[PDB]
Amino acid sequence: NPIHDRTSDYHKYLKVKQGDSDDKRYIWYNPDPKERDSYECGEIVSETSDSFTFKTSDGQDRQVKKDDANQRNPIKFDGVEDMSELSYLNEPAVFHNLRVRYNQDLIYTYSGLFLVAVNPFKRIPIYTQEMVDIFKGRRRNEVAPHIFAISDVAYRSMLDDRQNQSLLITGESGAGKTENTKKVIQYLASVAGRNQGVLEQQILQANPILEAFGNAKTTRNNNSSRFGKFIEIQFNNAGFISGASIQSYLLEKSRVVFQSETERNYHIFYQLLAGATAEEKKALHLAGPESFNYLNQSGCVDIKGVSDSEEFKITRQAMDIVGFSQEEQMSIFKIIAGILHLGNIKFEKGAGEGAVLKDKTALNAASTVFGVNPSVLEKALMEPRILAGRDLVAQHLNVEKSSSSRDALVKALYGRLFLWLVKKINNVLCQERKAYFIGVLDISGFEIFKVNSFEQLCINYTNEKLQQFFNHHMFKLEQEEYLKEIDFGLDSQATIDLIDGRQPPGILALLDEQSVFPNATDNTLITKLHSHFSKKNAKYEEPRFSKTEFGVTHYAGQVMYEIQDWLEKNKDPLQQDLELCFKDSSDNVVTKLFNDPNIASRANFITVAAQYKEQLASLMATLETTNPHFVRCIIPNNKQLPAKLEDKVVLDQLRCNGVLEGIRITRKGFPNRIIYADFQKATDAVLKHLNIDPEQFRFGITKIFFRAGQLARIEEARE
Numbered sequence: 001n002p003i004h005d006r007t008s009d010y011h012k013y014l015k016v017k018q019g020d021s022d023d024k025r026y027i028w029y030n031p032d033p034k035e036r037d038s039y040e041c042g043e044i045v046s047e048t049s050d051s052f053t054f055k056t057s058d059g060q061d062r063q064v065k066k067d068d069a070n071q072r073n074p075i076k077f078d079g080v081e082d083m084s085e086l087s088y089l090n091e092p093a094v095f096h097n098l099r100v101r102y103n104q105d106l107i108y109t110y111s112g113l114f115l116v117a118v119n120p121f122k123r124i125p126i127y128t129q130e131m132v133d134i135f136k137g138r139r140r141n142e143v144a145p146h147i148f149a150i151s152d153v154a155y156r157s158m159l160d161d162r163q164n165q166s167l168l169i170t171g172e173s174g175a176g177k178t179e180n181t182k183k184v185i186q187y188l189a190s191v192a193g194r195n196q197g198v199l200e201q202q203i204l205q206a207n208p209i210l211e212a213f214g215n216a217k218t219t220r221n222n223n224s225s226r227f228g229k230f231i232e233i234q235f236n237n238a239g240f241i242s243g244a245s246i247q248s249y250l251l252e253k254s255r256v257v258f259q260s261e262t263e264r265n266y267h268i269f270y271q272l273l274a275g276a277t278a279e280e281k282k283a284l285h286l287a288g289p290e291s292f293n294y295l296n297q298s299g300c301v302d303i304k305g306v307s308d309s310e311e312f313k314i315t316r317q318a319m320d321i322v323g324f325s326q327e328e329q330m331s332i333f334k335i336i337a338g339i340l341h342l343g344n345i346k347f348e349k350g351a352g353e354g355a356v357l358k359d360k361t362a363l364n365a366a367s368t369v370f371g372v373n374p375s376v377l378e379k380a381l382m383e384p385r386i387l388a389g390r391d392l393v394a395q396h397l398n399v400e401k402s403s404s405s406r407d408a409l410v411k412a413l414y415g416r417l418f419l420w421l422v423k424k425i426n427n428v429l430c431q432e433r434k435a436y437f438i439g440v441l442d443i444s445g446f447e448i449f450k451v452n453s454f455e456q457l458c459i460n461y462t463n464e465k466l467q468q469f470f471n472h473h474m475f476k477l478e479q480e481e482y483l484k485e486i487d488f489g490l491d492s493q494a495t496i497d498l499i500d501g502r503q504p505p506g507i508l509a510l511l512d513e514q515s516v517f518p519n520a521t522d523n524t525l526i527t528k529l530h531s532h533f534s535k536k537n538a539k540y541e542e543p544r545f546s547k548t549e550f551g552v553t554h555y556a557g558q559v560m561y562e563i564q565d566w567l568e569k570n571k572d573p574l575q576q577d578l579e580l581c582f583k584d585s586s587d588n589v590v591t592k593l594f595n596d597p598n599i600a601s602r603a604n605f606i607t608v609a610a611q612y613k614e615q616l617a618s619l620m621a622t623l624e625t626t627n628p629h630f631v632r633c634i635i636p637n638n639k640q641l642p643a644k645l646e647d648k649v650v651l652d653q654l655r656c657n658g659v660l661e662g663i664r665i666t667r668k669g670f671p672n673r674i675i676y677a678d679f680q681k682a683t684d685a686v687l688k689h690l691n692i693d694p695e696q697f698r699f700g701i702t703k704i705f706f707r708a709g710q711l712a713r714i715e716e717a718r719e
């Protein structure tokens with residue numbers, strides 16, 4: 001028994017070591033108030049009903065107020081598995097426990113409802129079959145923190161409550177959302193699939209494929225997910241996997257035509273370029289990424305510790321497993337290839353405010369591979385017909401404009417293709433006969449970058465709703481766990497409203513209004529916003545100086561956004577003639593992408609914001625029907641290094657994500673101040689022996705709710 005077997009890897013890697021043997025007061029102080037996050041521990045030389053006085057590291061005293069005191073929990077608490085047990089809940093205290101664990105390579109910790117996960121940035125052998133095996137049917141409290149644990153508890157709850165389940169895994173980029181997501185899947189595939197089982201493999205083989213097309217190297221992660229996802233794992237009434245469905249969100253289509261220095265475009269481009277046969281290449285009029293605009297710009301065409309070649313095998317291999325037809329494949333690759341050619345096209349001004357395509361090279365390559373007609377692509381690109389009254393005139397675009405349309409084309413295609421891959425995969429995996437499901441959400445948390453644009457507002461709106469769901473969930477519990485004699489998600493409402501309100505109209509509604517609109521510009525747009533909200537809506541901020549930015553007070557703080565391009569982004573335009581050109585494609589796949597309203601169109605067309613709000617609401621509607629579980633993935637630093645947990649990087653995250661918030665209530669909100677077993681009837685004996693004060697202690701029903709007080713003096717007592 002590994003749980004019992006202290007030699008087991010289980011014990012080693014998942015537990016704080018058991019050294020079986022069977023008067024002071026510290027604080028976390030900051031030797032630099034300018035460094036709110038760089039504490040030190042100091043001893044309290046004494047108190048005063050009003051304050052505390054300790055001893056700096058230097059051993060040269062200072063003195064704060066009790067009510068300002070970041071008291072250090074007793075050392076015995078150092079490494080506890082759930083922050084719900086700490087006496088002292090305060091930032092540094094919290095950090096300190098995470099740290100102590102992280103230092104022992106214990107990346108998982110609970111904080112009440114939350115599973116906190118700190119990326120280790122190195123391999124930790126804990127996702128082995130043996131490891132799976134150990135987690136089966138065990139309660140959270142019976143085994144070490146782990147993503148398998150949460151996964152198991154959701155699976156049991158599902159079988160026991162006959163209720164759908166959900167797992168919400170969020171956090172910043174490179175924090176390990178995706179890692180944890182796969183493990184959830186893996187564990188589920190193991191504990192509930194076929195042993196002595198094809199659907200499972202298929203279900204598994206779907207992630208590699210989506211990753212090839214939707215992930216990429218960024219400066220924060222070598223395999224960034226450039227789309228959000230919701231994985232519905234489907235079970236029959238017996239508790240075995242019947243199927244699966246994937247919902248994707250906000251693919252970063254722009255990355256196809258532009259990548260920052262050092263980053264890469266999507267994986268697949270490289271894999272394709274480096275994995276194709278000497279024969280498909282030329283067949284594909286292919287060449288090296290060096291020779292490709294969309295791949296020659298960032299200075300990076302490689303990922304260290306990565307073989308595009310080998311990875312291409314997989315993708316392919318996976319394609320076969322799921323079921324893509326060889327031709328479907330080729331076609332899928334033709335698109336990629338196609339896309340590459342288009343990036344190669346070069347518009348020059350050949351006479352006067354008009355682009356000319358002097359070199360028909362790249363054009364031919366694109367077309368040929370797209371199975372479209374060189375002549376109309378061209379005309380669709382450089383001279384699209386534009387409706388101007390009754391009039392449908394062909395319009396000659398300059399060079400700039402011509403390129404952007406070309407880019408718009410590249411993006412729809414990429415975007416469209418992804419859309420298709422997802423459906424096609426669903427076709428193969430999906431079951432609406434399902435009894436139940438366990439859904440896993442893998443998407444970024446709040447995002448505050450150097451520059452925040454329309455995409456960040458969306459992500460942050462979602463986060464705003466996810467956090468209110470958490471808060472509400474959390475009050476339900478309390479409320480219900482009180483069948484006897486403070487709604488928290490009400491607090492997220494104003495922000496939510498500012499963004500999505502209808503009347504008065506919020507940011508999105510104003511944006512939509514402007515997108516139809518005649519006098520349509522980024523400047524009219526930003527003016528309307530301040531006009532409606534500056535000094536008028538408490539969650540809004542008009543900048544002292546920028547004329548192109550605005551601030552929203554989000555849950556996790558203010559985020560300044562920039563409006564450049566919102567109108568275009570909201571409309572996501574694509575020249576219809578261009579729609580026309582492709583509509584008539586030789587390719588069977590290309591045709592779908594342009595002929596299938598379900599693919600080639602948004603839902604009388606709605607805008608991007610409108611589509612986003614909707615898919616957000618649908619998502620939430622779904623969640624509301626589940627028993628949710630919460631996973632907060634934490635990045636330990638910004639260097640992609642193990643062993644380096646920087647205070648500041650960490651505390652920021654615990655404030656944004658709501659572990660910290662969620663916690664502080666965990667002071668008042670003292671359920672988990674239930675030491676059913678403690679140092680029941682003599683459990684007042686003790687209180688009566690040490691004669692502690694009534695109303696710091698609490699008698700539940702054999703259960704409990706003790707005091708985050710004497711409790712933290714009530715342990716290193718000599719008796």
Ligand SMILES: Nc1ncnc2c1ncn2[C@@H]1O[C@H](COP(=O)(O)OP(=O)(O)O)[C@@H](O)[C@H]1O
Pocket residue numbers: 119120121122123124171172173174175176177178179180221222223224225633
């Ligand atoms: N449990 C884990 N063990 C090892 N590496 C991990 C773990 N979680 C994340 N990582 C590391 O971080 C990198 C990025 O993590 P990832 O799951 O992709 O984050 P996210 O999806 O949150 O952007 C991984 O590819 C890996 O190197």
Ligand SMILES: [Mg+2]
Pocket residue numbers: 177178179224225
């Ligand atoms: Mg990811």
